[PDB]
Amino acid sequence: SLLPVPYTEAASLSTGSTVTIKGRPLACFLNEPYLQVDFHTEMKEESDIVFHFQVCFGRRVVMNSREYGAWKQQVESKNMPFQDGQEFELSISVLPDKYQVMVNGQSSYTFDHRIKPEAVKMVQVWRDISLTKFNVSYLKR
Amino acid sequence: SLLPVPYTEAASLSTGSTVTIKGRPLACFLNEPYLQVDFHTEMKEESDIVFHFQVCFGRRVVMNSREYGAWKQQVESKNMPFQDGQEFELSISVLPDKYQVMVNGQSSYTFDHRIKPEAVKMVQVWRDISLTKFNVSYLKR
């Protein structure tokens, strides 16, 4: 929609940071659109990924990290709070021990830190969505 | 790029028809962009799919049909003629017994007809590509 997709923003994260995303799938869930959010260690798209979050709408969510070019241990969830045909609000909070993903206000996934969040330099949001809002908060020391 | 993605065009197919697509992946192959081409039986995106062609660039290709709302027997290929970071030219020829997919001029996949190609009313091209050319030929009786 308003923001370009794939969407890339330079970013820094630490405990207390929140990444907020508002968007809509580009296809009905029968057609299995995807959503992906990657927290990268550099601006380059081939850089390592501290937190990879990939939704296959209506089916499953996979989370992982990519470290020195290699994918690590995948975490697979069948939790599916996203609603067919609807706009979603996604919040990703940086807690001391993990990322916490809220979907439409509901805690829905968490992922323990494998790499310190301070390693993040870029966030990419892409695949089969339109994006109307993206924000990273910067209020904490 | 120039054409909107997801790209939808009303279409009719019969023996001798060719669907030609020129585009570029939106991500490096390390990030596993997808490409999908679906031949639908109606203009509605939830309609049945006579031919579903889904590339995970650098990894695999899956082909299938969706008949009365249900996916049928998946065909999986590890053939990967697509080149990292490059524009591709995809041709899909309607032969009497099958679809034949050419990638950059090279025969790369085929899929036997499960539903007559005359059932097609729409083609959708979507997922992680930009599109510069789309054509369906209409030269044959």
Going by C-alpha positions, the residue among B87, B105, B84, B79 that lies closest to residue B22 is B87
The DSSP H or E segment spanning A8 is: strand A7-10
Q: How far apart are CA A39 and CA A9, in angstroms?
A: 10
**Which residues in chain A have Cβ-Cβ distances shorter than 8 Å to B30?**
45-46, 69
Instruction: Provide the experimental method for this PDB entry.
Output: X-ray
A118 in Cβ contact with A51 (< 8 Å): no
Instruction: List chain B domain ranges.
Output: 1-141
Q: Which CATH architecture has domain A1-141?
A: Sandwich (2.60)
**Which residues in chain B have Cβ-Cβ distances shorter than 8 Å to A69?**
30
Would you give the DSSP letter of residue A12? -
A-B Cβ pairs (cutoff 8 Å, strict)? 36
Q: How far apart are CA A91 and CA A72, in angstroms?
A: 24
Q: Max Cα separation, chain A? A: 44
Q: Is the dihedral of CA B35, B39, B43, B44 positive or negative?
A: negative
DSSP string, A22-57: EEEESS-GGG--EEEEEEESSSSTTS-EEEEEEEET
B45 vs A6, A28, A69: nearest CB? A28
Q: Is the dihedral of CA B98, B81, B58, B19 positive or negative?
A: negative
| Whether B28 and A45 lie within 8 Å, measured CB to CB | yes
A46 vs B26, B30, B34: nearest CB? B30
Residue A101 forms beta bridges with which residues?
A: A92, A109
Q: How far apart are CA A116 and CA A96, in angstroms?
A: 10
Q: How far apart are CA B49 and CA A41, in angstroms?
A: 40
**Which residues in chain B have Cβ-Cβ distances shorter than 8 Å to A27?**
6, 45, 126
A27 vs B34, B45, B128: nearest CB? B45
**Which residues in chain A have Cβ-Cβ distances shorter than 8 Å to B31?**
38, 45-46
Give me the amino acid identity at B6.
Answer: P
Residue A9 forms beta bridges with which residues?
A: A123
In Å, how far are B65, B72, B94, B98, B99 from B112, measured between CA atoms? Answer: 11, 13, 10, 4, 6
A31 vs B26, B27, B45: nearest CB? B45
Resolution in angstrom units: 1.5
